[PDB]
């Protein structure tokens, strides 16, 4: 049948187009994929190739969605993609919070770091630890788990079944992210508090001593010194214990159709 190859190419591009809606938001969140790094002509070419690498159905048979209103569908897929972008981001936002807490305790309120791509305020420590976590995550091969959890998302819940994120856990999400950062930062805050009250108690004997101005000289040195001891566990304490994993897809999403 003569026209069959022509139609078979059009089925391919319709499938890729509907996959872009779900893959591109992930490229927006992750720190090594956002347009602060990967921009221009490569960007679309790569996103499309990935989406075709993970689409779940044989590419040469007609797409099933031709009978459906396009907008409700596109919005559905974009929402799903935003949820996945958050869950995959989760290990990086904790280290970023940690760095912001440290740079706030040591003074340093007027930090210099720059970041226009994501539109978020940044400080030198936050930028450093956010980079460092990303390189150890990549070096542990996590990039394979990212495409694994993408493919599983299509097998476990399908665009045509109106797959939807579960509400109850989403209501917990922000507080879990805050909690992990505080639990991890706690050792540096306590020592920086005790160091200040020690100078306060010392000032009782010499009331002209400016204990505040002294503490500003000390605290950045103490903060780096202490963070340098508990540094090495920062490798495993993120590479596994905070990384999302594909078995979690069962609980965060369900099919509503």
């Amino acid at each position: 049948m003569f026209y069959a190859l022509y139609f078979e190419i059009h089925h391919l591009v319709a499938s890729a187009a509907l996959g872009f809606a779900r893959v591109a938001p992930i490229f927006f969140f992750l720190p090594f994929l956002n347009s602060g790094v990967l921009s221009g002509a490569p960007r679309n070419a790569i996103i499309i190739l990935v989406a075709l690498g993970v689409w779940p159905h044989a590419l040469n048979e007609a797409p099933p969605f031709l009978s459906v209103a396009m907008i409700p569908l596109v919005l559905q897929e974009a929402a799903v993609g935003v949820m996945l972008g958050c869950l995959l981001s989760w290990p990086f936002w904790v280290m970023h919070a940690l760095g912001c807490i440290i740079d706030n305790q040591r003074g340093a309120t007027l930090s210099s770091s720059i970041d226009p791509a994501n539109g978020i305020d940044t400080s030198e420590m936050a930028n450093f630890l956010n980079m460092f976590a990303a390189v150890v995550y990549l070096q542990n091969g996590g990039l394979v788990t990212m495409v694994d959890v993408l493919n599983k998302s299509y097998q476990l819940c399908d665009p045509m079944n109106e797959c939807t994120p579960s509400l109850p856990p989403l209501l917990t999400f922000i507080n879990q992210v805050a909690q992990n950062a505080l639990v991890l930062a706690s050792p540096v805050v306590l020592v920086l508090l005790l160091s200040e009250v020690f100078l306060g108690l010392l000032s009782r004997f010499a009331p002209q001593m400016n204990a505040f101005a002294i503490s500003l000289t000390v605290k950045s040195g103490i903060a780096v010194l202490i963070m340098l001891l508990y540094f090495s566990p920062v490798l495993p304490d993120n590479v596994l214990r905070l990384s999302f994993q594909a078995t979690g897809l069962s609980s965060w999403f369900y099919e509503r159709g």
């Binding site: 049948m1 872009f20 938001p25 596109v74 539109g119």
Partner: protein, 50 residues
């Protein structure tokens, strides 16, 4: 249609005038979906930055 009736009907002017409608309309439909997805993603990025 896979090995039923016959192939290669490049040549009869009555069926060749029916193919013109389909070959055009499916190209337009596929072109439209490509824009709608870009618009949607762009709207999400616009809100999240702002």
């Amino acid at each position: 249609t896979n090995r039923i009736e016959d192939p290669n009907l490049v040549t009869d002017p009555k069926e060749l005038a029916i193919s013109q409608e389909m070959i055009s309309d499916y190209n337009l439909y596929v072109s439209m979906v490509s824009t709608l997805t870009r618009k949607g993603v762009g709207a999400v990025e616009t809100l999240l930055r702002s």
